[PDB]
Amino acid sequence: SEEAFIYEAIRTPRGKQKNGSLHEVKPLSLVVGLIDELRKRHPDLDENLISDVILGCVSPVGDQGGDIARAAVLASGMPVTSGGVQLNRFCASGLEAVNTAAQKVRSGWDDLVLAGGVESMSRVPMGSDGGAMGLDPATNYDVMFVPQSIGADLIATIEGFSREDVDAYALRSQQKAAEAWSGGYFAKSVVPVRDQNGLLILDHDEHMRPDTTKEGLAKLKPAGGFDDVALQKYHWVEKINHVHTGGNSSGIVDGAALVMIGSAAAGKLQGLTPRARIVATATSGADPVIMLTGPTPATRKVLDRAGLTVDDIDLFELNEAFASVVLKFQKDLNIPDEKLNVNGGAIAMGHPLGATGAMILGTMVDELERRNARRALITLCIGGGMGVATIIERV
């Protein structure tokens, strides 16, 4: 019945892993800073109408444990009735938080919900939470656990993506991200991070290497038995062509993102302009050893659910976890090259796990308005073999 609208969608710059600018900043501070910005843009907002704050976080330990969403509510001074829940669906935690918030708005039992994610990977490296596929050799041995890096290499091997093919996409992302920054595309949505004294800490995605050359990408070296474990399941392929490096894979960075989602009644009641409408969401997946595959059935499902086809979508935004994943996605659904990740992706700017799904969501919200276009589709691959997708419409 009720329709879910996006009223605000911001994010922090992504600070790199090595000697990063955001390494001294608690991941809680990153979320509070985005809350302080939403207040600045709507100072007369009745925060008591905010019924929940849903944050995605893949490594919820240490600085990110203890339901970091609730800590963002208390530390920022939001009303104690504003909820606060942390969830984890690996790489889609950010987009799942947005979708879940939209679903809670449609059911009618929630009026105005904040959604996003946070992941300070330089302070909490992925895997710090442990996991039931490492401390339990009985299940690890049975599910044939193989990391995401090897599945991406296996995808390139099966689909015939050469080392030159994936590095070409890495260069393409570095260029489109540098063009978007210099073009001022991110000026309104990227909220610079400051300290307790107002001093500047970071104002740009520093993982970017905008002077990248294809000659330099080919200089890079590629990334325990996992090779043999993968081929035991995919027995028709003899050898895995390892093509992915740190230059054509996603960047390990710190960052956070927030999205304000609510009903049209709650939007009118608070004087908020709806910037986009969430048309549909969907989840699905594929094999758990190649892992990444999963967006393709999840994208077909959200398209079928909204009664749309590929030709009805103006912009496609898929997280650049690995280059071969995006090239396989583009090959299958036959995505035009000028419609895919038009403002760059995680290869250049970074993949802060818990927040990435909410960053690329807000990136498409801006680019639709900047181009005066209609629809956009956002999706991400997931470890374990999952995948979520979302279609938005400009208003």
Binding site: H23, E24, D63, R123, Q196, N197, G198
Partner: protein, 727 residues
């Protein structure tokens, strides 16, 4: 990256000397004063020396940091720090980042660095020593070592927080060294780990340092010049916040500190704890940068400016003959005579003998005077077990206190301190029975709370030597001595009591004669606002909570029982009589109704057994349960900040009135007197600084103090209206 500020010019403070072995000796000798201090000159001087240690590192085997002054290195430039505005946060951050960048290079030079600590090494001085790899201290009288920037509202921003947590862990570094700015003697300094070796004299420092560099290079060549935290297998003592042994008790550290400060608005211990814990989660360099941000947060704040104004500038002027008469010479004191052996007179005999003076303790009977000296025995027996004094020292102390009841045993007394009941007739009788037995050139002091000194001085022959010497119970703790100046009191006597105050280790203020003086009068407006709130129907628990969260050492209702409500009623009976018969009209304070109501119920205070609290077996029990039914408590629920402000503003306004009436002659005496005498909260910097340094949701400064006062006047009464002197 640079070791310099900029990236005509300052002077130079460091001498360079490279011996034939390759050992550089950096001697700090700031020519602009007798003490090495952290200023523009040092920062630029150490910048050059550190640059030279890098350029000539091929021909350098070790470094020795020494001082040419009495002290090693003491603090920073408070004249410059007290001016840091919120818009100066960038410059403050860049300065401490530059200061620590020099020490970080000195620390990771690949060669041993030894500190030749001759004299005091406090604050920025100890931070330089902690950057070295080895510390030698000369065990000499007066030498101290510590990081006392928390006592000025600051934190050790030159690596003091980051390094002590690296050496001792989060818990021990915070409790022992940081949170209270504890100063250590060289013996205790070596015991806790701040110093490694001790030598007899200062001449042995530099030679013993080079001998250590020689042995370290020969015996430990791999780890020479490498701090423990710069090794591959470093394990922080007590663990890091990620280790489970510490993560079990770490969430309790902020709440325990919140219990220590009683909820007061003091930001420095909060920032020190955050910088320590946040620093222990990251590498040394990232930890050092976080330390700089919390430092810039405090220096640009208002509380740090209040503390720097009070405990630095104001205290220096007082201790430097600020209120003492100028053209008056000394007059040493031979033997002291104390009239009365209560908790006051017996405490005056203790601090007078703890300083070395011979004391004669007179009372009515020898039975009571021996119980007066028994007050000094218990304070000595406790000092023996805890270990502060020796056995031959404690015996020579009590032997100077000769208790007596004979008025003739005051023969040969050149300093008289009377401490009997507050009765003008009794003091006339007591001083009349003593003025002819003592010396002709003696000081006749009267520990008076409210009675004017001019009136008390009529009952003696030499009125020039009569003066008010107001002590505070317990005398062994309270550091202020309010000195009151009667009309016939001579400037010559002001100095002799001034010097006596410094001789016993106490801080003096000079006050002109008027009823209430300054301490008793201002603390009266403090208890009156709480008793009025109790009569107005405010919860008694909220009142005490407001007094503790305001920053006072004792909540107001608790203090009222210590002051005894019988004395409070008498003061009103006299003040009412001195206006009625004087041809006027008395407007009784609303607190007087609560005073008499407690007297009528037989609850006069702690001296009579029961007051606002109950007192079973000496120590204090809980609040009297009938207090709520007596005053209909709960019917008034004002904001807690209104309760807090009403107590702070009543004293702040009454302090301004004392400055208007000429009772106090300087803002410095008004601040230290309020802080040390009656316990005005230190974060304010004094009841006078509270006005000019006010900060609230309304604004900042004297203009905001007036606005908040008028806000209280609209809803609580006229007494919160500012005088013309602030408008």
């Amino acid at each position: 990256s640079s070791h310099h500020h900029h990236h005509s010019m300052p002077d130079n403070t460091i001498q360079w000397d490279k011996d034939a072995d390759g050992i550089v000796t950096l001697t700090m000798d700031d020519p602009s004063g007798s003490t090495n201090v952290m200023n523009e000159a040092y920062i630029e001087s150490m910048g050059k020396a550190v640059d030279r240690l890098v350029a000539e590192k091929d021909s350098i085997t070790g470094v020795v940091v020494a001082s040419a002054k009495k002290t090693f290195f003491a603090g920073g430039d408070v004249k410059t720090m007290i001016q840091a505005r919120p818009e100066d946060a960038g410059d403050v951050f860049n300065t401490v980042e530059t200061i620590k960048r020099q020490l970080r290079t000195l620390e990771t030079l690949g060669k041993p660095v030894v500190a030749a600590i001759n004299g005091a090494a406090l604050g920025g001085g100890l931070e330089i020593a902690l950057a070295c790899h080895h510390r030698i201290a000369a065990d000499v009288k007066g030498s101290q070592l510590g990081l006392p920037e928390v006592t000025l509202g600051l934190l050790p921003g030159g690596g003091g927080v980051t390094r002590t947590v690296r050496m001792f862990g989060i818990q021990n570094a915070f409790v022992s060294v940081l949170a209270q700015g504890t100063r250590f003697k060289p013996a205790k300094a070596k015991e806790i780990g701040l110093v490694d070796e001790l030598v007899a004299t200062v001449e042995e420092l530099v030679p013993a340092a080079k001998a250590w560099i020689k042995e370290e290079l020969k015996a430990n060549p791999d780890g020479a010049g490498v701090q423990p935290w710069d090794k591959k297998g470093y394990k922080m003592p007590g663990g890091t916040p990620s280790s489970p042994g510490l993560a079990a008790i770490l969430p309790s550290f902020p709440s325990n500190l919140r219990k220590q400060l009683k909820g007061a608005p003091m930001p420095a211990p909060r920032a020190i704890l955050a910088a320590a814990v946040e620093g222990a989660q990251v590498d040394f360099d990232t930890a050092s940068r976080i330390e700089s941000r919390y430092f810039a947060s405090l220096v640009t704040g208002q509380v740090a400016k209040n503390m720097m104004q009070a405990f630095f500038f104001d205290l220096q002027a007082i201790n430097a003959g600020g209120s003492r008469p100028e053209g008056i010479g000394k007059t040493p004191i031979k033997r002291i005579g104390v009239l009365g052996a209560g908790m006051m007179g017996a405490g005056i005999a203790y601090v007078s003998a703890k300083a070395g003076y011979e004391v004669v303790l007179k009372d009515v009977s020898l039975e009571a005077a021996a119980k007066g000296k028994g007050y000094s025995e218990k304070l000595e027996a406790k000092a023996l077990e805890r270990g502060r004094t020796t056995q031959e020292r404690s015996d020579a102390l009590l032997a100077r206190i000769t208790p007596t009841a004979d008025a003739a045993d005051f023969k040969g007394v050149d300093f008289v301190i009377e401490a009997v009941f507050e009765n003008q007739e009794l003091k006339h009788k007591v001083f009349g029975e003593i003025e002819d037995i003592v010396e002709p050139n003696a000081i006749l002091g009267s520990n008076t709370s409210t009675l004017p000194i001019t009136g008390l001085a009529t009952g003696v022959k030499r009125q020039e030597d009569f003066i008010g010497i107001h002590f505070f119970s317990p005398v062994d703790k309270m550091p202020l001595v309010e000195i009151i100046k009667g009309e016939k009191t001579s400037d010559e006597a002001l100095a002799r009591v001034f010097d006596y105050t410094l001789a016993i280790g106490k801080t003096p203020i000079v006050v002109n004669d008027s009823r209430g003086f300054f301490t008793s009068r201002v603390i009266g407006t403090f208890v009156n606002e709480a008793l009025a709130m109790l009569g107005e129907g405010v919860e008694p628990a909220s009142i005490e909570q407001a007094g503790s969260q305001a920053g006072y050492p004792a909540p107001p209702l608790q203090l009222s029982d210590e002051l005894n409500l019988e004395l409070m009623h008498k003061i009103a009976v006299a003040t009412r009589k001195g206006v009625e018969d004087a041809g006027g009209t008395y407007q009784p304070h609303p607190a007087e109704a609560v005073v008499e109501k407690m007297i009528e119920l037989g609850r006069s205070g702690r001296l009579k057994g029961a007051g606002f609290y109950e007192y079973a077996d000496g120590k204090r029990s809980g609040l009297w349960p009938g207090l709520r039914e007596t005053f209909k408590s709960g019917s008034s629920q004002p904001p807690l900040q209104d309760m807090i402000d009403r107590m702070l503003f009543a004293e702040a306004l009454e302090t301004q009135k004392c400055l208007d009436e000429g009772v106090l002659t300087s803002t410095a005496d008004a601040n230290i007197g309020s802080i040390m005498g009656i316990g005005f909260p230190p974060w304010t910097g004094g009841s006078a600084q509270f006005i000019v340094g006010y900060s609230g949701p309304a604004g900042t400064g004297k203009a905001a103090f007036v606005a908040r006062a008028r806000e209280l006047a609209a809803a609580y009464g006229d007494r919160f209206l500012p005088p013309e002197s602030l408008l």
